[PDB]
From a paper:
Helical virus particles can be either rigid rods, for example, tobacco mosaic virus (TMV, genus Tobamovirus, family Virgaviridae), or flexuous filaments, for example, potato virus X (PVX, genus Potexvirus, family Alphaflexiviridae). In each case the [name] subunits are arranged with helical symmetry around the genomic RNA. Examination of the RNA content of AltMV and tobacco mosaic virus VLPs produced from pEff revealed the presence of vector-derived RNA sequences, suggesting that the replicating RNA acts as a scaffold for [name] assembly. Cryo-EM analysis of the AltMV VLPs showed they had a structure very similar to that of authentic potexvirus particles.
To determine whether the VLPs expressed from pEff are accurate mimics of the original virus structure, the structure of AltMV [name] was determined to 3.3 Å resolution. This revealed a left-handed helix, ~120 Å in diameter, comprising 8.8 coat proteins per helical turn with a helical twist of 41.1 degrees and a rise of 3.96 degrees. The [name] of AltMV resembles those of other flexuous filamentous viruses for which structures have already been elucidated, including PVX, PepMV, BaMV, WMV, TuMV and PapMV. The density map was of sufficient quality to allow for unambiguous modelling of residues Phe5 to Leu203, and for the placement of five RNA residues per individual [name]. Like PVX, the AltMV [name] comprises three domains, domain I (residues 5–26), domain II (residues 27–155) and domain III (residues 156–203). Domain I takes the form of an extended arm-like structure, embracing the neighboring [name] on the outer surface of the virion. Domain II makes up the core of the [name] fold and comprises four alpha helices. Domain II is connected at its C-terminus via a long loop (107–155) to Domain III which comprises a single alpha helix (residues 156–177), and a C-terminal extension (residues 178–203). The interface between domains II and III forms a crevice within which the RNA binds, whilst the C-terminal extension of domain III extends into the filament lumen and interacts with the coat proteins eight and nine places ahead in the helical array. By using spectrophotometry, Northern blotting and cryo-EM, we have shown clearly that pEff-produced AltMV-like particles contain RNA derived from replication of the pEff construct.
Numbering used by the authors: 5 to 203
The structure:
RNA sequence: UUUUU
């Protein structure tokens, strides 16, 4: 190895990606299938934003019942969300790409729908959506004039501590069985007692 | 990776 010199560390191409966002190769196998849904060529970020806006109020699980007709084309959201659930990228991974834009578009104006009953205090309610780690990412699509306001520390602590509570609501309903068969599960649906409801 | 109902 040639003991890197100054000219080499002065002629570096700065370029950052992240595995929390869908790979650049996956951003094309989505656009090519969107136009295949008769979607306009130029207006391809609008339809994706109109889905990020829906996952901002209901969530980004793979089990989210996406319902609603788009107001920008003749394509329904369900077939947009089902297109984006292909080629490997998860829905949440996709909404993470536009998180910095939905931040500007909706913060301090309209909170996520499911915060009154997701464990968020009223002051830190605008981080009440998953994929909130999309603004902690300089790789996601950034808004023209930067973010409206940086997330506060309270909001981050909340999104962290509430991310773990939900994981101990999903992982506390399933089992540590590694097979759905009737010989391993023995019929038991869950593998853990009601330590999954009480404190 | 897992945050819906």
């Amino acid at each position: 190895f040639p003991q890197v010199t100054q000219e080499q560390m002065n002629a570096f191409t700065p370029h950052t990606t992240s595995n929390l966002l869908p790979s650049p190769e996956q951003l094309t196998t989505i656009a090519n299938l969107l136009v295949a849904a008769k979607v306009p060529a130029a207006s391809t970020t609008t339809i994706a934003l109109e889905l990020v806006n829906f996952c901002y109020d209901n969530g980004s699980s793979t089990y989210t019942a996406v319902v609603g007709p788009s107001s920008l084309a003749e394509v329904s959201l369900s077939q947009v969300a089902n297109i984006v659930k292909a080629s490997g990228t998860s829905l949440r991974k996709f909404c993470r790409f536009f998180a910095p834009i939905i931040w500007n578009l909706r913060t301090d104006k309209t909170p996520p729908a499911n915060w009154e009953a997701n464990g968020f205090k009223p002051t830190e309610k605008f981080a009440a959506f998953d994929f909130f780690d999309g603004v902690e990412n300089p790789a996601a699509m950034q808004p023209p004039g930067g973010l409206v306001r940086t997330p506060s520390q309270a909001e981050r602590i909340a999104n962290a501590t509430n991310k773990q509570v939900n994981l101990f609501q999903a992982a506390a309903q399933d089992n540590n069985f590694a097979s759905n068969s009737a010989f391993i599960t023995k019929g038991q649906l869950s593998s853990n007692s009601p330590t999954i409801q009480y404190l």
